[PDB]
Design a protein around this ligand. Structure first.
Ligand SMILES: N[C@@H](Cc1c[nH]c[nH+]1)C(=O)O
Ligand SMILES: N[C@@H](Cc1c[nH]c[nH+]1)C(=O)O
Ligand SMILES: N[C@@H](Cc1c[nH]c[nH+]1)C(=O)O
Ligand SMILES: N[C@@H](Cc1c[nH]c[nH+]1)C(=O)O
Ligand SMILES: N[C@@H](Cc1c[nH]c[nH+]1)C(=O)O
Ligand SMILES: N[C@@H](Cc1c[nH]c[nH+]1)C(=O)O
Ligand SMILES: [Mg+2]
Ligand SMILES: [Mg+2]
Ligand SMILES: [Mg+2]
Ligand SMILES: [Mg+2]
Ligand SMILES: [Mg+2]
Ligand SMILES: [Mg+2]
Lengths: 143, 143, 143, 143, 143, 143
RNA sequence: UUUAGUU
RNA sequence: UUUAGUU
RNA sequence: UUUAGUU
RNA sequence: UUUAGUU
RNA sequence: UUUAGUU
RNA sequence: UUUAGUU
């Protein structure tokens, strides 16, 4: 069962929406990294999250295993952001995002190992400032 | 452009993850609605959000216009929750959700009229307590 | 290249939105079929088009080949009607349709053989009279 | 309920398939605009429809609200045209389209306000003349 | 990099299309599972693969972690089988499948840990013997 | 019913996974062609398969009919390879594939005419050698 | 869990 | 068309 | 509409 | 990787 | 197969 | 925005 005070999803979201909180999360054993990326190319959003996650040590820079888990978690988060077609520029739209990646065990059982959450918050709209509205996305996966 | 203090998406999410914070939102002019629904049938989730939204007065009980806006906002939020196949029971999975619906103008220009946000947060997993992880979804639409 | 006077897609649509215009189409060599179906189950819509198509002789009642072509043509038309999730009842929505199936060669070269078009037109909406709007779909396939 | 002689969907389609009809629609209070666009890039089809709709006055050129409604209506129409993957060039295919955008109240109740329909008709196929077949798409949304 | 003699995907497929080749795979350290399932309900296919996988010991019966990895691997394999809409009965089609689940490390580095492959092969078609053709799907995931 | 020793799907797969077999297939009346393509652009994978199929005579180089059947078969195979989003480069991923196209009648009834199968096998992953795993895809269609 | 099926 | 690739 | 669940 | 943008 | 429907 | 296109 999920540990009520270790909900990796809720935690990554609250962090993202509240502009410290990182040090507290880290003290509790979480691996954390925040970042911002904007683009009309989805691969760039994927790249920033991966680069930030590897440089901040949220995931191993070596091997495929952890990169694979993060890729699919990012994909799941992109579903919430794109809602239907995981396309930006080709569909005449752009995104301005802030992201958070959290890694750790959210379950009561230590045997559940580590899991990872990718959360995205920002705006999506036509490529013209103001013609936009909010967008959110959260992907969760086992590492 | 979006009004920094009126980000309907962010506000509906913060509320969902928390006192009558509703009182404050309502005092500021927002039409608010909170509820909970769990099921293996997506139509039941859609129904609870609609019913609760009409009963609380977040949208007009009469006409199609506002129901239509809410339905699509709900569909968009369901993308973040299902991430790929907007299916539950048929894919051997169930969802336990808490939801919020916020209606109002989030832009600086009052000419933008009302918009509506549907936020979902809970767990999704196999039909067995514990075999689950968090799920999240936000849909925004003009109304 | 497509024969200007034999645009199967356009012709099946015009027929659907209208005298036995069938007589004229049939005199020109087209195998035509018209019908109506309403439901909250997509499989019932697929079944009516198939049954009506076989009974009217638009496709062979024996073998798989022609049934296969029609099934995919129907799937393609269903995309225009559902626009995203080929789901009805499970997404708390219902459809009221009128359909047409036209079979024949729409190209200048007679070597292109027969092709089939499935056209759908009606309304889609919540399970409540009036809370609905139009829906449309066309699928084309070789047969 | 939908007004039988004000079916915005059927009307936009009939207009598109019949090469005047505009003046009659306009006299009845409809905001109308016709256009043609061909491309291997979906954003270009979206751009043409938006530009034509704004220049002809079918939607306000200012604000996001109406642009937002038109964007989603165009997206819905693209589902019928692409059927599965809202991709053209990346999937080695191209489209040659004619489009119509109609705006007005199709319901018996004046309270339903304005709605908008985006209709597309043309051909889709490999990037080689003749290797193609028809394609249709209709998206309907509230403004 | 992937170990030429340990390509889990290829191996699970070859097995599915064939003596206890299981014995050889097991001797090499692979956890293997073979089974068959037919249905018009995708959840029944997912259930048989899971049950058979846990009973045979391919994945842990306890905890969520490994069930989670298998569920997604199964979802991915279902994409190849359904190709578009992960639906069966609701789309008037049925499936007759044979499946294999292979677990182990397919990379040269032992640090990559275990991965899991789900392979499906059988027929898909209308609910009528003979009106069908082959279907195939492979899903791979870290575990 | 499908002829047990003429299963076009299984046959194309076995050929693809076993590095002759072509001459034997050809002697039995099958039209066959093997090839390899790698890219971050899906249209290139589609192009190689089409070019190889036409040059090797698996399908007529003239007319649309057979090109149309092959296009959709390739699309169906790509579902198994991409599983969700038929995108490569835009989603920061690349594929290294080997492909086989088989054409002939797999049914007991000669009246079923010719059918075609497109099979893909290789690896998919981030654009960095080693950070990848296997991927399969099979599409079947009537010609 | 130990291959489905009629409009 | 004659297997791709670094954020 | 006032959180779901076993193959 | 250290928030995008005009048809 | 001979247009659906309430949370 | 004033119908696209070769592997
Ligand atoms: N509203 C679109 C984005 C957009 C494009 N153009 C205008 N807005 C979405 O939901 O993604
Ligand atoms: N983890 C799945 C849900 C699930 C089904 N079975 C186990 N878990 C998801 O992301 O939706
Ligand atoms: N408007 C929805 C249908 C609907 C469901 N509820 C209300 N309307 C659609 O486009 O399919
Ligand atoms: N037939 C494809 C288009 C195409 C691409 N190549 C040949 N035809 C479709 O339905 O979109
Ligand atoms: N041929 C369909 C299945 C089917 C339904 N009806 C006839 N056949 C597919 O590819 O899934
Ligand atoms: N694992 C991804 C490919 C990938 C991209 N980056 C790393 N891997 C897939 O299943 O397609
Ligand atoms: Mg999951
Ligand atoms: Mg939007
Ligand atoms: Mg086609
Ligand atoms: Mg709608
Ligand atoms: Mg993967
Ligand atoms: Mg098929």
């Amino acid at each position: 069962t999920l540990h009520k005070e270790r909900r990796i999803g809720r935690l990554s979201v609250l962090l993202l929406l509240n502009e410290t909180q990182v040090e507290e999360l880290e003290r509790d054993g979480w691996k954390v990294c925040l970042g911002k990326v904007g683009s009309m190319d989805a691969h760039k959003v994927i790249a920033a999250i991966e680069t930030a996650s590897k440089k901040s040590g949220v995931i191993q820079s070596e091997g495929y295993r952890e990169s694979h888990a993060l890729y699919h978690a990012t994909m799941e988060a992109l579903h919430g952001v794109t809602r239907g077609e995981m396309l930006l520029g080709s569909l005449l739209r752009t995104v301005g995002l802030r992201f958070a990646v959290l890694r750790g065990n959210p379950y009561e059982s230590e045997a559940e190992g580590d899991w990872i959450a990718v959360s995205l918050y920002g705006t999506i709209g036509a490529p013209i400032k103001g013609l936009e509205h909010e967008t959110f996305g959260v992907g969760i996966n086992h590492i």
